[PDB]
């Protein structure tokens, strides 16, 4: 449950979900990375449910970050009303991933261990993923 | 020193017990007792100060009081 503290205006548009990734597709922090390759959303509750499954296989050992902090709100109008009187209230938060940008960076681990643990949290995400390690 | 609105001040002689080393100015006025010429030949009525007789630094005051020091043979 990562949230923004302050948001300027609480009801915003939806992002243009086409194109490539902006940047952030080179890993900078860990030795091992997990990037995406298809074009969905992630809804601020995967990103912790891929964090608790990540931590426990490594038993809270080496360093693990995230890279995707959700900024945008998204609204669902309440239970079965007719169309059009104004937008509904927010209910979650979101951050759109393009193809080819890094989600997770991990370090302080051998190769044969962390390549398992990224796979076990790749099934908690609504996206297709692919292992990667420090473009040199 | 635009005209009009200010009170007037001018020199004096401050008759100190040590050389009376003050011929500077001020707003005080009374009867000119002892005029001079080497200083400001003006209202001499600046009476007395304690300027140059015992500074806390550039002089010598009386001694300190008492330590433990039983110099009275109890």
């Amino acid at each position: 449950m990562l949230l923004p503290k302050r948001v300027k205006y609480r009801r915003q548009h939806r992002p243009k979900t086409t194109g490539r990734s902006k940047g952030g597709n080179y890993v900078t922090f860990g030795e091992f990375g997990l990037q995406a390759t298809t074009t969905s959303w992630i809804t601020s509750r995967q990103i912790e449910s891929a964090r608790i499954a990540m931590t426990r296989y490594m038993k809270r050992g080496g360093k693990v970050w995230i890279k995707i902090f959700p900024h945008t709100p998204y609204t669902k109008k309440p239970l079965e009303v007719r169309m059009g009187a104004g937008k509904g209230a927010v209910e979650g938060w979101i951050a759109v991933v393009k193809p080819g940008r890094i989600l997770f960076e991990v370090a302080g681990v051998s190769e044969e261990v962390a390549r398992e643990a990224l796979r076990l949290a790749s099934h908690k995400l609504p996206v297709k993923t692919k292992f990667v390690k420090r473009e040199e | 020193m635009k005209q009009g609105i200010h009170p007037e001040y001018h020199q004096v002689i401050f008759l100190d017990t040590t050389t009376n080393f003050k011929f500077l100015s001020g707003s005080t006025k009374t009867s000119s007792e002892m005029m001079e010429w080497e200083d400001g030949k003006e209202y001499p009525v600046i009476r007395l100060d304690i300027s140059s007789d015992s500074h806390p630094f550039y002089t010598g005051r009386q001694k300190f009081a008492a330590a433990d020091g039983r110099v009275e043979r109890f």
Binding site: - | H6, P7, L24, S27, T28, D49, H55, P56
Partner: protein, 166 residues
């Protein structure tokens, strides 16, 4: 007038051969002497504190104003002070008023001046400025004088106040 010729006979050879300046017109001259006296009352007490400073240096004294009209006391453009510049025939004279001796409780004023090369002071009440009388003044007329020099070293401010007790 004699204070100026001691500034033109005594400190000339000293400060140019202790600090070792090259030219002759390099010594720290004394610029303005500002005197600011705040008042704790934003109502009426400053009506009676106008005359106090004018007995010490007869320049009329500006009543300043606030800038911001801050939190829990005052609104904009009141009066809370009285600055007075003292520049040439006064700065050679009010600094020549070396009678802070009336205060007498260890007249040694300060050790640390300020980081930039000025030198601010303090007073408390009817002690200094020996022209005034201790009869008609049932209030602490305490002031805050200053002394700024053309020097750019606080070590130079340490030497230049050789004749005011620290």
């Amino acid at each position: 007038n004699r204070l100026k010729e001691k500034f033109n006979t005594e400190v000339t050879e000293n400060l140019m051969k202790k600090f070792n300046y090259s030219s002759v017109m390099e010594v720290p001259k004394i610029d303005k002497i500002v005197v600011n006296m705040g008042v704790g009352d934003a109502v009426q007490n400053s009506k009676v504190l106008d005359n106090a400073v004018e007995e010490l240096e007869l320049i009329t004294g500006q009543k300043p104003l606030v800038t911001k009209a801050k939190k829990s006391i005052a609104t904009f453009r009141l009066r809370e002070g009285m600055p007075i510049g003292a520049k040439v025939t006064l700065r050679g004279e009010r600094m020549y008023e070396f009678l802070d001796k009336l205060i007498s409780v260890s007249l040694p004023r300060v050790r640390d001046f300020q980081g930039v090369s000025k030198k601010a002071f303090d007073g408390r009440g009817n002690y200094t400025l020996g022209v005034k009388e201790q009869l008609i003044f049932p209030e602490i007329d305490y002031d805050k004088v200053s002394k700024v020099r053309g020097m750019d070293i606080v070590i130079v401010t340490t030497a230049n106040t050789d004749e005011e007790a620290r």
